[PDB]
Amino acid sequence: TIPHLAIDPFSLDFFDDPYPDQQTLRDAGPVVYLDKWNVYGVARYAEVHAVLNDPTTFCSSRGVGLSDFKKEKPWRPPSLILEADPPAHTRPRAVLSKVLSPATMKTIRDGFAAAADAKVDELLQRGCIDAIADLAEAYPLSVFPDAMGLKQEGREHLLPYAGLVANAFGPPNELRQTAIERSAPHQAYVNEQCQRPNLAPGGFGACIHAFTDTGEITPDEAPLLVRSLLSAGLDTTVNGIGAAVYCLARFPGELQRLRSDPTLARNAFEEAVRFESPVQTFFRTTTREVELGGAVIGEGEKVLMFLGSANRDPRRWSDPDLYDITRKTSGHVGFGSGVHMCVGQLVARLEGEVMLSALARKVAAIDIDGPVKRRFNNTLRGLESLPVKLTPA
Ligand code: HEM
Ligand SMILES: CCc1ccc(C(=O)O)cc1
Numbered sequence: 001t002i003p004h005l006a007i008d009p010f011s012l013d014f015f016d017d018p019y020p021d022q023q024t025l026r027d028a029g030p031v032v033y034l035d036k037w038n039v040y041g042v043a044r045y046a047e048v049h050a051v052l053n054d055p056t057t058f059c060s061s062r063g064v065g066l067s068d069f070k071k072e073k074p075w076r077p078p079s080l081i082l083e084a085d086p087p088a089h090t091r092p093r094a095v096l097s098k099v100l101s102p103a104t105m106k107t108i109r110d111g112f113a114a115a116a117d118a119k120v121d122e123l124l125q126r127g128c129i130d131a132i133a134d135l136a137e138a139y140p141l142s143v144f145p146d147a148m149g150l151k152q153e154g155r156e157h158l159l160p161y162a163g164l165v166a167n168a169f170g171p172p173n174e175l176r177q178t179a180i181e182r183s184a185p186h187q188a189y190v191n192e193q194c195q196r197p198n199l200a201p202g203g204f205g206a207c208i209h210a211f212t213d214t215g216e217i218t219p220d221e222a223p224l225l226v227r228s229l230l231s232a233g234l235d236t237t238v239n240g241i242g243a244a245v246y247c248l249a250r251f252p253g254e255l256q257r258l259r260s261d262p263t264l265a266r267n268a269f270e271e272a273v274r275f276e277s278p279v280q281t282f283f284r285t286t287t288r289e290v291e292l293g294g295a296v297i298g299e300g301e302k303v304l305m306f307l308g309s310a311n312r313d314p315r316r317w318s319d320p321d322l323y324d325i326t327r328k329t330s331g332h333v334g335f336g337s338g339v340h341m342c343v344g345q346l347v348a349r350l351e352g353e354v355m356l357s358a359l360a361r362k363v364a365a366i367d368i369d370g371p372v373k374r375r376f377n378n379t380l381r382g383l384e385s386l387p388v389k390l391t392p393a
C-alpha cells in the first residue's frame with residue numbers, strides 16, 4: 001500500500017538538485033518508505049504539518065536524526081529541548097523563549113542593524129565579493145558570538161561544530177563519519193564555553209544561567225541549553241542570509257521591489273526561508289502504531305519530514321518555485337511548527353531583516369560573476385561560494 005523508493009535524500013546527487021526527486025517523493029503518495037535507510041517519509045505539506053503537530057505520536061525524545069536513541073547511544077548528550085518531549089521539554093523551552101524574547105530583541109536591534117549597514121557599505125567598497133564568506137558568514141559572525149557573550153579565543157570552532165551537529169542528524173554516510181571522527185576539539189571548546197564563568201554578563205548565555213534562580217532549570221541544565229544556542233543559532237542564519245542574497249541575485253525584479261519599499265525586508269527574508277529552507281529535513285520516531293496517509297506505521301519507526309519539499313508543495317503554495325517577497329508566507333515550515341517551532345526565530349528574522357534592509361537601501365544590482373559552489377550537509381542546504389558584483393545605489 002505504501003510505495004517503496006530507492007531515492008537517497010542524503011546523497012550528493014540529491015543535494016546538488018533535490019527538486020525533481022522531491023516531486024517524485026510528493027507524487028508517489030502522502031507516505032513513502034525509503035529502502036536505502038529503512039525509514040518512512042512524508043514530503044507533502046499536509047502530512048509534514050500534521051506530523052509536526054502530533055508530538056505524542058511522533059516524538060523527539062528518541063532523536064531528531066536517523067539514529068534511534070533507544071537503540072544506539074547519541075554522539076553527544078541529548079539536547080534538553082530539541083531532543084525532548086513534553087513535559088520535560090516545557091520549562092527549558094520557556095527559558096529559551098524568554099532569553100530570546102521580543103523584549104530581548106529591543107536590546108540588540110541597534111547593534112545588529114548598525115553592523116549590517118556597515119558591512120554592506122564595506123562590501124560596496126570592494127565591489128566583487130563572495131556573498132558567502134564575506135557576507136552570509138561575516139555578518140552573523142560579527143553579531144551573534146558577541147550577543148551570546150562569547151570570549152574571543154576559540155571562535156574559529158563555532159561553524160565547524162555547527163556543521164558537525166547538522167551532519168550528525170543524517171544517516172551513517174561518509175559525510176557523518178568524517179564529521180564525528182576527530183570532532184573532540186570542536187566539542188571541548190563548545191562545552192567549555194557553555195560554563196557560566198566563560199559567558200559575559202548581559203549575553204544570551206549568562207541570561208540562561210540567570211534563569212536557574214527561578215526553578216525553571218537547574219544549574220546543571222543551563223550549560224546544555226547554552227549548547228543548544230551554540231548548535232543552532234549561527235550556521236542556519238548563514239545559509240538563510242546566503243539564500244536571500246542568492247534569490248535577490250537570481251530574481252532581479254524582486255530586488256527592485258525591495259529597493260522601492262525597504263519595509264518588505266522582513267517578509268523577503270521569510271520568503272527566502274521558505275524558498276531555500278536551510279533546514280531541509282528532520283526526523284520523528286513513532287510512539288505507537290499510527291495511520292498516516294492511509295499507511296499503517298508501526299511503533300518505534302523513524303519518520304523523515306522533508307521540510308523543504310513541504311514549502312514547495314503546489315497543493316499548498318501557488319507558484320511554489322517562484323521567489324515572491326509579497327507572498328503570504330505564514331504557515332511555511334522552514335522554522336518548524338508546533339511545540340518545537342524554532343525558539344530562536346526572532347534572532348534569525350532580525351539578522352535577516354536588517355541585512356536585506358541594508359541591501360535594499362544601498363545596492364542597485366547584484367550580479368553573479370563567478371563560479372557558484374554548493375555546500376553539502378546532511379541537514380542543511382546552502383552555498384559554499386557565491387561570487388557576486390554589487391552595484392551601489
Ligand atoms: C534561518 C534560520 C533558522 C532556521 C531555518 C531554523 C530552523 C529550525 C527548525 C526547522 C526547527 C524545528 C526542529 C524540530 O522540530 O525538530 C528549529 C528549532 C530550534 N532552533 Fe532554529 N532555525 C533557525 C535559526 C535559529 C536561531 C537563530 C536559533 C537561536 C538563536 C535557533 C535555535 C533553535 C532551537 C533551540 C530549536 C529547538 C526548539 C525546540 O526544540 O523547541 N535556530 N529551528
Ligand atoms: C534546528 C537545528 C538545531 C540543532 C540543535 C539544536 C540543539 O542543540 O538543541 C536545536 C536546533
Ligand SMILES: [Cl-]
Binds near residue numbers: 187190227
Ligand atoms: Cl558538544
